[PDB]
Design a binder for this molecule. Structure first.
Ligand SMILES: Cc1cc2nc3c(=O)[nH]c(=O)nc-3n(C[C@H](O)[C@H](O)[C@H](O)COP(=O)(O)OP(=O)(O)OC[C@H]3O[C@@H](n4cnc5c(N)ncnc54)[C@H](O)[C@@H]3O)c2cc1C
Length: 272
């Protein structure tokens, strides 16, 4: 109520105006959108995301994104987007629908936001409120540590939580992040993650892994396995929560079964 929220109902689409573009690398962008007034906030609880929706080439396309801005930000929302260009991966000649749609927007164009959405909310100081499904009440579990597995753009739901914890000097939850990508080129938001690690090392552990690592590389190599789970996530005996977001293949065949191997109950594993 104090600051006016933009996402007043989840059943409503809000056309937000694109006000700024930023080329980060060849295929990664930051887009900024104007909230309805400069004193609005988004209205997005930690742990949840929004959907963009648009009519692209005659079809309705809906996709989830987690902003890198937060409810402290007045007047705007920022998204970091990986663009899947056509005519690039000869085996995905068409590219990605939504990300190329965003790449093509001009300053002034609008796009429809809706939310908040998602089964998990972070309540602070270790309190996670997790719905078994969209229609049931949340179960509330209090952890002292959170393990996090992210592939590609899956980092933006981790970062939102990481930040939410580090802002709060009274939040002593320890976050352990294992970040998987294809090539060093593809470590999205590396400077942000490393600045946070520089300041908050006692509450933030960070480790990468790469499918095709360069010759000078100090971190993991290959897919997520038993050993990386043991070495870079809190142990199952600490009763940690474990969060996952990334390409469905990695989550389903690389993460979940090995999490089961090591001993993390599936009740303490959550996929965004
Ligand atoms: C909780 C959550 C948060 C998310 N946060 C973000 C975020 O912050 N930023 C973000 O950018 N995305 C985010 N996403 C992902 C986003 O929802 C989309 O999956 C992504 O934008 C791709 O959508 P698209 O329509 O463009 O691609 P699609 O049309 O769905 O593309 C189909 C698929 O083909 C493959 N593909 C196509 N072209 C290429 C190519 N050139 N190279 C390689 N593979 C290719 C990719 O696997 C691609 O996803 C998030 C998803 C979830 C669930």
């Amino acid at each position: 109520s104090t600051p006016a929220i933009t996402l007043e109902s989840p059943d409503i689409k809000y056309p937000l105006r694109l006000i700024d573009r930023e080329i980060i690398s060849h295929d990664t962008r930051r887009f900024r959108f104007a909230l309805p007034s400069p004193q609005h906030i988004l209205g997005l609880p930690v742990g949840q995301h929004i959907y963009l929706s648009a009519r692209i080439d005659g079809n309705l396309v809906v996709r989830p994104y987690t902003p890198i801005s937060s409810d402290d930000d007045k007047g705007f929302v920022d998204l970091v987007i990986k663009v899947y260009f056509k005519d690039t991966h000869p085996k995905f000649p068409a590219g990605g629908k939504m990300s190329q749609y965003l790449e093509s927007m001009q300053i002034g164009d609008t796009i429809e936001f809706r939310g908040p959405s998602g089964l998990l909310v972070y309540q602070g100081k270790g309190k996670f409120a997790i719905r078994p499904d969209k229609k049931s009440n949340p179960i509330i579990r209090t952890v002292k540590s959170v393990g996090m597995i992210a592939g590609g753009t899956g980092i933006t739901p981790m970062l939102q939580v990481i930040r939410a914890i580090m802002k709060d000097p009274d939040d002593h939850t320890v976050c352990h992040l294992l970040f998987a990508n294809q090539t060093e080129k593809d470590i999205l938001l590396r400077p942000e993650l490393e600045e946070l690690r520089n300041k908050h090392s006692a509450r933030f552990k960070l480790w990468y892994t790469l499918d095709r690592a360069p010759e000078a590389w100090d971190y993991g190599q290959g897919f997520v396995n038993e050993e990386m789970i043991r070495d870079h996530l809190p142990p199952p005996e600490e009763e940690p929560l474990v969060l996952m977001c990334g390409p469905p293949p990695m989550i389903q065949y690389a993460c979940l079964p090995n999490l089961d191997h090591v001993g993390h109950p599936t009740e303490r594993c959550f996929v965004f």
